[PDB]
């Protein structure tokens, strides 16, 4: 009644997903910083 009832290498994207998230996030932060500087310079023009 105890034993006769017996019933019991490559790297995946999941391993390195964090680095992809950081890359894209950084690309975004960079685009934002660039646009902010561009807007500041546009307003800076001596009217």
């Amino acid at each position: 009644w105890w034993y006769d009832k017996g019933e019991c290498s490559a790297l995946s994207l999941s391993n390195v997903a964090g680095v992809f998230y950081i890359l894209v996030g950084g690309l975004g932060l960079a685009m934002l910083v660039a646009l902010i500087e561009f807007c500041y310079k546009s307003r800076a023009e001596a009217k």
Partner: protein
């Protein structure tokens, strides 16, 4: 030349082993650069060597007293409960107190109830019970 911004860039680039656009030309600058280069070599080599293992990846009564996140119970009126209630050993008396004080009542009303409560608690509920039932369960789906 190395202002604060260019110096932060030189250092970051050295650590990421990604080469440079400028390098110190003076004696003091070259001493600083040398030690940073050595530090980078040891630390990056060690990161890569240990990334050669991290590459993709509780079992006692004392361990049970150690784990307070897990709540563990016995049959409410069961020989496990009575053995905990009338215990004289320290570990079992501490377990009896924990059962009597782990609120709500960790006790279940049937053995299969305690099993299913564990099987439906994602390891946040544990069952204290007789060894024969465990042997049968661990041997059966």
């Amino acid at each position: 030349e190395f202002g604060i911004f260019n110096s932060l860039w030189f250092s970051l680039g050295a650590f990421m082993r990604q080469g440079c656009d400028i390098s110190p030309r003076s004696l003091s600058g070259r001493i600083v650069g040398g030690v940073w280069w050595f530090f980078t070599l040891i630390i990056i080599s060690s990161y890569t060597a240990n990334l050669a293992a991290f590459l993709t990846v509780i079992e006692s009564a004392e361990d049970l007293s150690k784990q307070t996140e897990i709540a563990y119970g016995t049959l409410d009126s069961g020989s496990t409960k009575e053995f905990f209630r009338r215990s004289k050993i320290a570990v079992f008396d501490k377990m009896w107190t924990y059962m009597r004080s782990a609120e709500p009542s960790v006790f279940v009303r049937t053995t299969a109830e305690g099993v299913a409560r564990v099987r439906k608690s994602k390891g946040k509920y544990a069952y204290l019970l007789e060894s024969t039932m465990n042997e049968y369960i661990e041997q059966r789906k």
